[PDB]
């Protein structure tokens, strides 16, 4: 036996409904959402950290000449210089006093502490959604997890269920994402190979222990002034350090719809947006045919005071004369007023109090007990407090957001003017007819 409903996507808020099988006693149903997840598909571009400039020991040739080769290390640089005559602690180091060339080298590596301080660059794609539900029907409970796509069947062996699709597409992730020690940022980094000095991504590699590293750090070599021995150089600042000074705040403090951002793997947890349709198939043994339930004989709805707030601010009491003993359920029928109980215990003559919540300035709904209907009506005062710590349970539509007193005013004044013109017009056709009578 099938049944289809819509469910709002907000955790920790039950949604109630009643399935009316033609042949048996009605059946209660409650659907709560316990946890949701949103997980995209990713792939890695490179890793980045601070660099370490290594400068080897220079080589000198006394009175010959040298020239430079080419190698594969990261940002290699080389230069040759003229007649120098250099000095160490023991004294002068060559024997021809000019024509004394000297060679200089430089390149970059990874600092030894980068195994804890690094970043990863990622590209992201379409997202998926996956939920965990709690379902009560009759006198049994069940848990399960499904994919909200539209086709994939659900879970365990007793209850068929299929969800999807979602009524809104939303992802908090942009097309390019950075990750550092558990914080997630929305950045736009250069590609693999488009290095430029002084910005993020001036040194790049595919892993922390690889052997092929590329870089561009704008290093240039100068000529020695004082004659002891050394090699001078100048360089730009590391883009990693400059980015850490202007990072901004992470994504754990900007995501809309109030989401939780967690890594390993990348996911957004417990968001609240849009509506979800659900079809469900119920086993046949859980229906109990009508000849066993109680049968009631009269009912009347008396309503006590009420408030329209975000918590349970009302009351009512019914009056029944049953025929047997049983446990038939109750239910509200209007989409602006929700109940709190599910079933009751019944006897010959008695009463029962139930609690509800509402979002309309007057209560005008119908209540069904054991299958029998009754109407309730009164007026509802506006709330006292200003701020509370709960979420609202029902939405708010334009129709029943205006009182009935206001409707009496707006109607009679409006239609009063229109009713004045129709009598103002029939007199004319009368007049003409009288003028036609005048001829």
């Amino acid at each position: 036996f099938e049944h289809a409903t819509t469910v709002p996507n907000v955790p920790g808020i039950p949604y109630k409904a009643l399935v009316e099988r033609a042949g048996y006693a009605p059946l209660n149903l409650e659907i709560t959402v316990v946890s949701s997840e949103l997980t995209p598909s990713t792939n890695k571009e490179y890793v980045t950290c601070k660099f370490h400039t290594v400068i080897p020991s220079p080589q000198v040739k006394c009175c010959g000449s040298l020239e430079c080769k080419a190698s594969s290390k990261a940002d290699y640089t080389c230069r040759v210089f003229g007649g120098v005559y250099p000095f160490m602690w023991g004294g002068a180091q060559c024997f021809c006093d000019s024509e004394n060339t000297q060679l200089s080298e430089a390149y970059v590596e990874f600092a030894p502490d980068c195994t804890i301080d690094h970043a990863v660059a990622l590209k992201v794609h379409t997202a998926a959604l996956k939920v965990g539900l709690r379902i009560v029907y009759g006198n049994t409970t069940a848990h399960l997890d499904t994919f909200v796509n539209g086709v994939t069947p659900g879970s365990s062996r007793d209850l068929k269920v299929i969800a999807g699709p979602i009524s809104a597409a939303f992802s908090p992730f942009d097309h390019k994402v950075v990750i550092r020690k558990g914080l997630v940022y929305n950045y736009d980094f250069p590609e693999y190979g488009a290095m430029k000095p002084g910005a993020f991504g001036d040194i790049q590699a595919s892993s922390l222990d690889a052997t092929d590293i590329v870089a561009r750090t704008d290093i240039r070599l100068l000529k020695p002034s004082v004659k002891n021995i050394h090699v001078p150089y100048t360089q730009a600042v590391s883009g990693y350090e400059m980015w850490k000074n202007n990072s901004g705040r992470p994504l754990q403090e900007t995501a809309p719809f109030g989401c939780k951002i967690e890594v390993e793997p990348l996911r957004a947890s417990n968001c609240a947006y849009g509506h979800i349709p659900i079809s469900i198939d119920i086993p046949d043994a859980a229906f109990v045919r009508s000849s066993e339930s109680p049968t009631i004989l009269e009912v009347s709805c008396t309503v006590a005071d009420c408030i329209y707030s975000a918590d349970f601010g009302g009351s009512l009491t019914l009056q029944y004369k049953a025929d047997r003993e049983g446990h038939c359920p109750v239910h509200s029928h209007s989409t602006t007023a929700v109940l709190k109980e599910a079933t009751t215990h019944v006897t010959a003559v008695g009463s029962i109090t139930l609690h509800f919540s509402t979002s309309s300035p007057q209560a005008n709904f119908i209540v069904s007990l054991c299958g029998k209907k009754s109407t309730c009506n009164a007026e509802c005062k506006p709330p006292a407090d200003h701020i509370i710590g709960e979420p609202h349970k029902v939405d708010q539509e334009f129709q029943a957001a205006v009182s009935k007193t206001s409707w009496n005013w707006l109607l009679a004044l409006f239609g009063g003017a229109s009713s004045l013109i129709v009598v103002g017009l029939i007199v004319l056709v009368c007049s003409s007819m009288l003028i036609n009578t005048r001829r």
Partner: protein, 104 residues
């Protein structure tokens, strides 16, 4: 010091120091009364949709006025095309019940 923030029907979340997050939601406690006189119906709904009331409450209170202006106009229409044809009998007499409106 002290700082001021505004909340709506969806909510707000604030974090202070090394503590845990805290969440708050808003309600519908505006002055007036939706059951008293028309005098105090307006102050209620106006506050509730304030930036909308410059569309939504001033909208509906306005269309009220145009209806009663356009209506009382087109009733004078009927007086024109019916009073004038009456007196189109010069040197004659009519029922007084209508002979009282032809003079004005």
């Amino acid at each position: 010091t002290s700082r001021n923030f505004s909340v709506g029907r969806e909510g707000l979340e604030y974090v202070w120091g090394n503590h845990e997050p805290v969440r708050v939601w808003a309600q519908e406690s505006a002055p007036g009364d939706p059951h008293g006189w028309p005098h105090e119906i307006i102050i209620h709904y106006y506050h509730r949709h304030p930036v909308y009331t410059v569309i939504v409450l001033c909208g509906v209170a306005l269309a009220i006025l145009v209806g009663t202006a356009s209506s009382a106009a087109c009733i004078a229409k009927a007086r024109r095309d019916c009073l004038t044809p009456y007196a189109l009998a010069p040197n004659a007499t009519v029922p007084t019940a209508l002979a009282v409106l032809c003079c004005i």
